[PDB]
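hey team, just a heads up i'm posting the complex here instead of the shared drive bc the drive is being weird again. everything in one block, sequence lines first with there labels, then the predicted structure for the whole assembly after. its two chains so it's a bit long, scroll down
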Amino acid sequence: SNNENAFYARATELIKLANQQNQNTEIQTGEVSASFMWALARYNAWFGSTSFETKEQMQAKKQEMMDYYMDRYKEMLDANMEDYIENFDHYRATQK
Amino acid sequence: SNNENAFYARATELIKLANQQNQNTEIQTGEVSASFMWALARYNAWFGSTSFETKEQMQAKKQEMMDYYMDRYKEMLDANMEDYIENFDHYRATQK
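-- predicted structure starts here --
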């Protein structure tokens, strides 16, 4: 209905919080994005604690578990790039 | 006061939203982190529009602006890894 197969509705509330922080006039739009950035950096690293049993074997996997933290929202990120990229001419055509 | 140099007091509200969705007992903590993942992807792709002048050049920079998304919350992510890692000897001791 509102979401097809993905958690669109829920993840949308995550961004909804960011909207409130960006409502401040003297704040940079880049401050809120970076806040979401740092927030994911903490929230997503939480799963390191379930990679291995000992911190010894866990620590060696830091780079391996993080390979799917950097890269793994990137294809979905690019999927939102085109919305502005291939539509540039359209938006460029609506500005008068 | 609630943050030193970084937007700790702000980014924590972003995670705070995740806390509400994490209140759903039948859901895994991972379905919330994944939402934050997809959410950040959409939010970061916004900056693509202010990267270049034409979509021709802009589109060719997508992977370059999408180098500093993935590979940039990286260092701040591992910064959280070490925290839990070094304190494994601590957490393992406080729990049974």
